Structure formats: structure tokens, C-alpha cells
């Protein structure tokens, strides 16, 4: 129980090509929802040398100027000069989007329980567009109720971005990676064994001002003091040689290729779905959000120390084929009872999720980097079902 295990998780900055594609997809989604709140979006972004390629499907009654939005989006993460390896003013923007206003195409189609079963229930009205598997997780290791490794990695990359943006370390460029290996004595994290920060930078800086500055201004700020131990914690700063060129020129970036960074950083299983570029009617996003919501409410209410909520949807069906609650020996009550408690407290049907979390708003661009979970100001991070859960449990 006191045994020692090494647990590793990682994050990338907003300037990473994969994350840049995610941000582009979600920026598109946000603009569309800003003009039309029932807009249906599946936007995929490919990012590569000299090029942004946006493809996918859109159903809306608004119009967004996509190329300008894309260039705007590329500018926000910092690719504004050619020397950085990518430049919003001079790169090509390619569009292959099937855009339909809902008069053409159709409205969202009828669920199985409406069409084959003949249900009059209005919350049954929207079925899952696709087959899906979703996992939500919460644990009291951290104040945000998140696993610590992904939390620390996210803080590292987030801070790495902010020291660049505020001008404190102006030699920094957008691309970046951070990795954290934490020592766990059973379920309790003790300290960080290894921190790795890879930061894109101008050749003006040399490795030792780079290392000292990143350790002092990024690592020690981003990682709580208790977990950093001098002489035992190993700090690796750009261990791969120098990192002058980064972003799209170096590598091809795609929407939905950072789904573990997006979620729990390898602490728990994942269902395979990607978040960005998808409107809330895609259960891949909304049901995962709802799963995080359920798990976080369950843990915050004191019914568990660790909770994993699994949702699964059959295509065309509003109601989940499976709902499960897992407490790895941490539950106040048996897991099955916790499961039924959850079934009565929560409503995992798509329309119900959308209404309960108020998902039809342009709120998704900030999720595009640094994780969808563990951050304040998101609907699925509000623990407002605590007392309902506590009363149902007793």
C-alpha cells in the first residue's frame, strides 16, 4: 500500500501544431455558434508547412469568414513572423467545408426511442449521432479534483505560454512541451522525480540562461513547492538540443491528436473521441463533459475520493447503453448503489446534457489548449449537484 510507482503525464503549449489545429477548429465552432446557437459543426483542421487546411461539415444559418478567422487564430498563439516557422499573414488557407443552412439538409434527426420505440418524451428527442464511449474522472489529489501529473504538466505549458506573452522572456517562441514524472506512494503523490520542458526560442539565448530562466520563472511557479526537491528532482530543459524552429513547419498538426492531453493525461481509460471542432450535439464532447461533471460532483460531495464515470451511447439512441460508477475502494457506499444514485441525480441524454450545462454558447476556444478539465469557469467544472447527491446517499 506504501509501494512506490512512477507516474508520467505530459502537455503541449497552444503553439503546438496539434493544439493549433484544435484551436482553429474550436474558433470556427465558436464563431458559428455566436451567430447561430443551434449550429451543427464538425470542423477538422490540418496544419503543415505554409498551409492551413480546413475540412468538414457545417449546418448553420450564419456565416463566418473562415480564412480570416484562421489567420486570426494563428496570430493569437503567436505565429506572426516567418522566423517562428509559421506566419499568419503569409501562409495559405485552404477550405473544403460542406456548409449547409438547415433549410437545406435537415434538422437534427429523430432518436431511436422516437422513431422505432414511439416515445413522446422530449428529452428523448435527440439521439446519439454516432456510437460512443466516454470516461469522466475526479480525484481529490488536487484542489481542482484532477490527477496531479496532468495538472502539473498543464500548469507548466500554460505558464510557459504566459511568460512569453507577457514579454517577461521575449526570446521564447510559441511551440512547447512539458512532461512530469511523479512519485506515488500508493495513491498519495509525494514529489516530482523529473520535469522536462522543451521550449521554442530564438537563437539569441543560450542554453544556460534558457535553463535558469525556465526553471525559475516557469517550473518553480507552475509546480507547488512541496513537490520540488533539490538534489532529487531532475530538471531537463530542452534535452534534445536546440529548438529554434517549431510549429507547422516542423510537423504536421491535426485536430484531435492530443485527446489524452485534453483529458486526464493517462490516469484513466479513454473512449477515443476528440473534442475540438464539434458542436454539443456530438456526444463525443458533451457526454465526456457530462462525465467529468458527474465524477467531479460525486467526489466533491464526499461520496468518494476517486470516481470514474463511464458512459456509452448507441448510435441513434438518446439513452446510454451503459452508465457505470467506479470508486477504486474509495466509495462511501457500494459502487452499484453509487451508480443508481447517479442515474437518478443526473440525466445523460444529449438534449438534457446541453440544457443542464448550457452548452449552446461560444465557450469552446479556451478548451483548445491546457486541458478541458480542472479549470474554473467551465459549466462541467461546477459542483452544484453536491447536496442533491448527499441527500440521495444519506
Amino acid at each position: 500500500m506504501r509501494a512506490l510507482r512512477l507516474v508520467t503525464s505530459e502537455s503541449v503549449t497552444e503553439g503546438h501544431p496539434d493544439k493549433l489545429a484544435d484551436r482553429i477548429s474550436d474558433a470556427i465552432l465558436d464563431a458559428l455558434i455566436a451567430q447561430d446557437k443551434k449550429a451543427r459543426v464538425a470542423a477538422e483542421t490540418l496544419v503543415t508547412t505554409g498551409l492551413v487546411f480546413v475540412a468538414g461539415e457545417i449546418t448553420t444559418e450564419g456565416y463566418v469568414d473562415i480564412p480570416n478567422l484562421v489567420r486570426k487564430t494563428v496570430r493569437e498563439v503567436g505565429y506572426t513572423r516567418a522566423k517562428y516557422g509559421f506566419d499568419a499573414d503569409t501562409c495559405a488557407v485552404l477550405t473544403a467545408i460542406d456548409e449547409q443552412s438547415p433549410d437545406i439538409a435537415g434538422g437534427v434527426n429523430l432518436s431511436y426511442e422516437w422513431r422505432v420505440l414511439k416515445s413522446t418524451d422530449p428529452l428523448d428527442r435527440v439521439g446519439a449521432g454516432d456510437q460512443g464511449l466516454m470516461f469522466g474522472y475526479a480525484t481529490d489529489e488536487t484542489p481542482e479534483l484532477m490527477p496531479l501529473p496532468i495538472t502539473l504538466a498543464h500548469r507548466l505549458t500554460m505558464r510557459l505560454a504566459e511568460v512569453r506573452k507577457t514579454g517577461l522572456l521575449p526570446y521564447l517562441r510559441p511551440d512547447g512541451k512539458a512532461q512530469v514524472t511523479v512519485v506515488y506512494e500508493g495513491d498519495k503523490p509525494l514529489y516530482v522525480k523529473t520535469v522536462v520542458v522543451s521550449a521554442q526560442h530564438s537563437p539569441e539565448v543560450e542554453q544556460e540562461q534558457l535553463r535558469e530562466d525556465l526553471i525559475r520563472e516557469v517550473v518553480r511557479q507552475a509546480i507547488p513547492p512541496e513537490y520540488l526537491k533539490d538534489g532529487e528532482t531532475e530538471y531537463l530543459i530542452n534535452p534534445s538540443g536546440r529548438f529554434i524552429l517549431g510549429g507547422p513547419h516542423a510537423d504536421t498538426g491535426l485536430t484531435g491528436r492530443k485527446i489524452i492531453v485534453d483529458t486526464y493525461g493517462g490516469a484513466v481509460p479513454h473512449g477515443g473521441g476528440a473534442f475540438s471542432g464539434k458542436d454539443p450535439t456530438k456526444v463525443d464532447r458533451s457526454a465526456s463533459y457530462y462525465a467529468r461533471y458527474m465524477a467531479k460532483n460525486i467526489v466533491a460531495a464526499g461520496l468518494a475520493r476517486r470516481a470514474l464515470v463511464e458512459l456509452a451511447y448507441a448510435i441513434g439512441k438518446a439513452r446510454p447503453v451503459s452508465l457505470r460508477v467506479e470508486t477504486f475502494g474509495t466509495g462511501v457506499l457500494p459502487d452499484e448503489k453509487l451508480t443508481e444514485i447517479a442515474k437518478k441525480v443526473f440525466d445523460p441524454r444529449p438534449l438534457a446534457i446541453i440544457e443542464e450545462l448550457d452548452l449552446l454558447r461560444p465557450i469552446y476556444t479556451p478548451t483548445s489548449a491546457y486541458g478541458h478539465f480542472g479549470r474554473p469557469g467551465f459549466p462541467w467544472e461546477e459542483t452544484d449537484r453536491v447536496e442533491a447527491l448527499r441527500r440521495e446517499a444519506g
Copy 2:
């Protein structure tokens, strides 16, 4: 031990736009490696209406005709007529690939333990190209030593492909999905609560002939009769209405958007890496394969009923930052002992992995669908270190 839990997993056929992208990427990899086995590949495929768009990076002394290869590849999976929604003969094939002759670029750069630590060890020479987190899994629930739900799902989609290909059900078209919800009594699978198959077909056929044909020719054959139980198991065939148009026309397909389908179907955590389009020097692929190799060998050797092997790599480093073996109370020995045994039996450095499995061969197209694991004839599915493990165990 007595309580009942629902476990859901799913698969897609080779005709799925995501999986089609995967197959294109791996076909490119196979073709390149056939002519040059020191070839370095990161090929990403976007698939959409009328278009295959291939981007990424390629180092070779070989030449592969990408459009001809793409069209051949689209043909194999069955998209040969416009009516199916995609057609190998008439679609556009776009290329944006940075192709490297090793004359330009360089050889792979020196690892951290070579450059910074001063290792003369040749197995230390190649470092992880990128930071990574990898999970390998095995369990004795099934003969393939894989979790049952993903196994059943894979068998469903695989066979759904084969009845189409043999002409047995000649109205079938390439796209398809299968989902399985299995009832678990704790650790033991009992029976399938729900089977869902969505199959693409010509509209000449209607759903009750479809239901009868798919239930008898796909479900009861692909799933062993013990897990099919009369009166309790529900069969859903095309619950989403009908499936006439499928593949790229309906949806955009991207490389590496089926990573859970590729692996364990949600039984265990995932590290986020995609397999297809990447040569074995990318640890995201080769180390995941190797982790599977270790776990499968450990379980097959009788040291555990279930084994999870975790590998993690720091960028530029040959040696893993974490290596862990977890048996969920199933180990013959304590997990630390099993870990030490694993470290003595296995060598998880990148060069060592490539050499131990001889991964530099054109063997990767068949991995593109129906799972990278649980299938015979792949180097990482060979349990040939069983007796070494048994000797180390005692």
C-alpha cells in the same frame, strides 16, 4: 465480487473514413519501407468528399508513387463506384509531403545519454524522438489474451467486412460500425447485454432482411454462442435509420482518430499516440507494440491473469523515464518483483525494440483496421519470452 457492471467497447470496418485514412498512411509507410528499410515516415492522411489529402514528412532512398498507391488502397477497401459515396478512380489525390533524402536532413541525432551523459552503449544511441506515454495490456479472459469487448467488436467489424468481400451478402458497402455491451460479474464476462451493428448497404435491401442476414451471418458467427444468450441479449441493426452513404462523403477522416479502437477499446488507459503513418523509430508506435509484447508474454507465462505495462519516454532519451508493471491482484509475485523481472527480460530502448521485433518490414497495412493487438502473425503478438520469464520467476 458478486455485483454486476456494464462494459462497452466498439470497432469500425476498414471502410470507415478514419480507418481509411489510417490504411492510406500505413500503405504509404509499407511501400516506402519495402524499397528502403531505413526510411523515416510521418504520413498524415485527410479524407473527405472527392478528396484524399496526404501531408507529412518522408525520408527515403526509395520512391513510391503516392497517388497510384492511394487509389489502389481506396480500391482494396471497396470504394470502386460513386454510388458508395467515394470512388478510387475519380477522386482527387492531393500531396503536400516534405520528402527527405538522407543526403539532406541528417541521420537520427544522438541521444541525451550519448550527448549529455556520455554513453558508449550502442543501444543507448537512439533516443525518443518525442516525449511519450505508452500502455500495454494482456488478460486471460480470451485466447488472444485481449479484453473481451474490444475482441468481440473487432471480430464483428472484421467479419462484416468479409461477408461483403466474399459476396455472401453482396448488397453490403464498405462502411460499418459495431458496438458491444458486455455484462461483467466483477472480473468475469458473462454475456452480451447489447450488440449494435450499423452496416452500409445498397438501398435495394430493407431492414428486416438486413436484420436477419446480419444477425445470422455476422453476429452469431463472430461471437461465440456461450456469450449470446436467448431472451436477454438485444440485437440492434442499423438503429440510426439506414446507412446508404458512408465513408469520406458523409464524414471527414483523419489519421490517428481511432486510437482506442486500434488498441484495447477502453479497458485500460492510453497515452495519446497514433500508430499509422509512422515508421518504427517513433516510440509512440514501436514502444506501444513492445508494451503489448511484454504484457502478453507476462500473462502467457502464467505470472499474471491480467497485466498492464506502462512505458514513458523523455524526448531525446533512449531509456524510459518510467517503466511499470501492474497486475490488478492477479500476480504470482509482488508487482515490484515482476517489474524487476521485466527489466531483466526486456529491453525497452528504441533501437533495442526495433531490432528485437525486426519492425523494419512492410507489415503495417494489416494493422490499419480491426486492431493492432489480439491478432496472430504480428511480431509483438509472439509469446516467445515465456520461458525466460518463468526462469526469472523460479
Copy 3:
């Protein structure tokens, strides 16, 4: 003069890939200016296997959904099934347009005579966007006041299109070409020495039924019996073997690669400008139309049998650097007097042209095939300046 000359001219149908690109480009222009009358468009279309690629520059406060417009446009010229080699439903549509409101960008900046000379004349305010040389032609050999060879070619391809569209020859497909070689009495045509018609067709029909059908339903209708001479006029029908596959699949199509077909078919010099995809502020288009307008009016007023009008523009300048009129010995008056008469009757400044012909209307899609000149219902084909020219002449 009694000596015999061979004069050849040719045309293509609306289904030719070059002409398809022209039509796509002009359709975009029409849709944009329909919404905004000062919208600035330079739209270039590339057409190839499975792909329509739209690039160029757009300046507007309107929105046009390019992919649906492209698909509708492709449907109109007849590419509706894969069998034809191109299909509106299944092809890829790519967009790489710099689209700007004048929100950034600007209205056209001030002309040279406004900025450097200080002209207060509002018709002087818009200068030529580019350096240019323009030719307009008219001749009384045909009723449309056009050179006969190009006229007969246009009539041929137009009729081939018409027998295809009405169902008279239902095996015909969109692509087609026609060539005419005429025997000349120095200057006036006697008869057609050779007619060549290449028509795309289903492989069900064969060449002697194709030959009879095309000669009787296309050639003899489109060419007046006066010019067809038994025993001397040679009919070549598909001399290249069968024409099953056509359009974008056989050949790559680009905007502005049929400029001689667009104009006079080689009777007179050309300045190099393309028409399609350009709004009327591009003098390459508007000044050429206007040149045709002047020449046609000059011939219709009886001042000449043949008239060639030369315009030349310096970049940034509203007023043409040269205006010249040529009657190849056919003028009632000396060529200089015709020139000064024209200078008094006509105003070839860009804004002046636009207002005089009312060019800011969605009138350009029908111009994309079968010639910009020689057809009724176009502003520049209106002979409403006849009486003014006649009074100036006397």
C-alpha cells in the same frame, strides 16, 4: 483577289474543362455582384480529376457559398454522373480565396489624372487597374457582325450542347470541340473546306451513327447550306477515335485559357487579357467589351464593312493612351476621321464604360462559353449608337 485562302477557327462546348473553369469563375462573380455592385472579383478556377480549386482575390460585403455554387454550376453543364468523368455531387471543391471587405483593403485608389494631374472629373477618378491592350472587331460577313469562321464554330459547339440538352441525341456527354476551315475570296468566305466535330459520347453508340447524327442534326443545322458544298466540304467526326471520357478527368482546366475562342477566333490581334472571373473594373474585360461595342456600332451604322478598334491603357490611368480605328480599306471616311468621330461619340474611360453599358449586374455566366461576342442580349452587342455616328459622319 481571285486567289484562294484557307482560314481556320475553332470553338469548344461548355463542357470543356477550360470553359468549365471560366463558367465557375463567372458564376462566382455573378453571385458576388448580385449582392454587392462594387464587389471586386478576380477569381481563378483550376479544374482537374475529382477537384475544383478556386483561388484568386475577392473584395466584398456579400457572402457566396462557393462549394454549393460550384456544384450547381458543374451540374448545369452536365457533369452529373461519374461515368462522364466528372460529377458535381462527388467531386472535391477547394477554396483559397483572399476575401476581404474594403473594411481592410480599399476602394480603388485614385487614378493618375486625379492623384498626379488634378482632375476633378468623377469619370476620371477610376484608372486602369493594369497596363493593357485591347481589340474590338466587327465585319458584315455575318448578321451578328462577326468573322464567319469563329461564328460557325460557336454555332457548332452551341448546337452540339443543345442537341445534348434537349434529348435529341441522348448519348452525348458535355465535352466537345468544333473546328472550321473556310475557303476565302481574298476577303469574303465561299464555302467550308473542312468541319471537325469532336463530341463526348457514351461508348454504346458507334462512329458512323455518330457521324450521321452529328452531320445531319448538328453540322447542317448550324452551318447555312450556302457554305456547305457537296464533294468539296469534308466532314470529320471524332477523327481521334472515341471520346468517352472528357472534362476535368482527361485534361486540366484553368480560367482564361480560351481567350481566342472567347473573342474573334484569330481574325484579329489580341491583347492577352482574360475575361472570366473579373469584375467590370478590370479593363481587360470592360474595355474589350467596349471595343467590340464601338466596332459593331461603326459597322452597323454603315461607316465601314470591317472595323477594328484598338484601345490601349497605361496603369493607373483612366484615359486610354491610344484609340485607333481601322477599316481595311472599307471605310466611308478616312480612318482618322472615323477615329475622331469615335472619340466624340464614345467614352472609353473605365467608370464611363461601366455606366454606359450598365455592367454592374449579374450578366456574365452566359458569356463563359460560345463567345463573348456575336450574341444578342449583351449590352456591348447593342447597336444604339448608330444614329449619333451617322450624324457625326453626315
Copy 4:
């Protein structure tokens, strides 16, 4: 014959996006012909912001790396920096080439006179791939036997390129235009009325140093002093305001959109065909070259002062449907006699042309700018048929 007329012609520099597309196309053609001399090439290039798009069809089995070749080609023309808006290193290169080896597809198919007529003549064996109309021109106004205005225009843009490339005027950027209006006293050019140079430049230089530098180093070097008259010749330098922003970023460039600049600058009719990206079996190129060859030989032989040679081809036919020679009252013999003399001296069949001019060599890149005609060292500029013509004439 004695009247005074203004004759205007124009040119663009190699950095003009249209001309850059031409150069890329021909660079592709040249590399292919270097590896395979029977290579069949139809390469079309689109050039725009952040993008070079190469499409078309190639039948060869040598191999050329298109992106590398494209970037080299963009570099030589001077686009090496982001501030120019376009850069060989950072732009995306897209390929949609219907590549083929002649094992698949076929060898060139049989000409009409082989397949339908039964000719054993080997020079009849290759027919025209498409219908075509070609014009060749020569006149003794200049030593090169070219019309003077386009000659001067070409010399201007060429010199504007060289003063930039060599560093003489280091503030210059690649894009540029030149126009010349020449005073003709009937047949004889007398002097240049107007020269307009529009040159792309950095904003550090302003208009009066630009004007003096271009007039002194470009205009006066490029135009012989005989045609320049101080006090009557007007020099306009960048009359359209500043020209800081240029190239592909300002305007979209396409292959074959400068065909009049390529040829005779508006002196004579044109057939509509484009040259660049096409191998010698395309009569659009080879027959135009051969027509220039014939005309130049006729003029150089003293048979005429000015000669216009028209060729026309029916699709699938080796032998021209029309051949015409016109001397505008300048012929020693009547134009007819000149025409048949031309028919016996020359052989305008495609294969004969290819052999007579030795066209199967990588010689086409230099033609991509500054005119295909009037330049030394080109096969079609060689006057080696003079004495044969003189003897046939007597």
C-alpha cells in the same frame, strides 16, 4: 503607308506571378525531359498566397521531385524573403499530378492518317493531340526579325530583372511591368512616345531616386538611343502609386496567362494556346515554334519584308488542315506562290518538327519569361532554310 500611328506593347518580369507559374511549369518539363526525353508533360501551375499548386498529367518514368524543383525555381526568380509576401522556403507546395509510366496508359496513339487512312509514312505517325491554331510572325523592323514594341518591352523587363539580381538597384523586388508606346510612320517605327515601368521595391526608396535610377539604368540601357528623343519621349515610373506589395501574395498567377507577351505582343493574331508546361508533342507549342521558324526564314531569305504564317491542326491528324503565308503587300512573289513554296520547303507534321528543331532537350525554362521569340540560341530562331527558300523562289 505614310500616316502616324501609336503602337503599344508590354511585358512583365520573371517575378510576375503569371510568369513565375510559367517558369515552374517549364522547370518541371525540363527536369522530366532531362531524365526522359520522350516524356509527355502537361503541367499547370497555380501560384498564390502561401501556395504553389501543381496539377496536370505526366507520362514518363524518370522521376522528378516536384516540391524541391518548385522551391529552387521560386528562389531563382528572387522570392527568398517573407517581406516580399512570397518565399521559396516557407510556402506550401501542393501536387495533383496524374502521374503515369507509359507501361500503364500507352504510347502515343495512332494518327488519323495511320489509323483511318492507311499510311506507312513514319512522319505521319504522330497526330495532333488537340485541335489547334498557330501563328508565326517575322518582320525586318529589328535585327532579331521581331516587331519592335514587344522587343523593347522584353528588353525593359529583362534589364529590370538584371539590375535587381546583380545588386545594382538593391531596393528592387521581383514583380515588375513595362509598357512601350512607339510612334510608327506607317511601316517604319520612328521613336518611343512613352515608356512605363512599374517596379516592385522596398519602402526605404522613394519616387525620385526610383525614377532617376530606372530611367538611367533600365530604360536608357534597354532602349537604343535612336528610339529615344529627349523632350518628346515621356517616362512614367510607377504611375500607379507605390509598388511595395507584389507577387503571388498580391495576385494569383497561372500558367499560360501571358501568351501575347510570350509571342508577338499584339502585332498579329494568336491561336489561344499556351506554351509552358508542355512537351514537344503538343502542337500548341511545337507548331507555334515551327511557324515562327518558317516566317523568320521567309523574311531572312528576302522573300518578304513581313511574313505571317498560319498553321492549323485537326485533332488526331498529323497533317495541317490549313497552312497560309501572308505578306502584307511585302512579298517578292504573290502570297499564294509563297504559301506552296513554304509547303515544299517545310514539314509541319509534329514528329518532323520535333526532329527538325531537336526539341527533345531541357531547353525550355529560359523561354518562360521575356518572350519565346527573337532570342538567340533557340532552334526556331535559326535561319538555316534561307538558301533552300531562295532557290525555290529563284
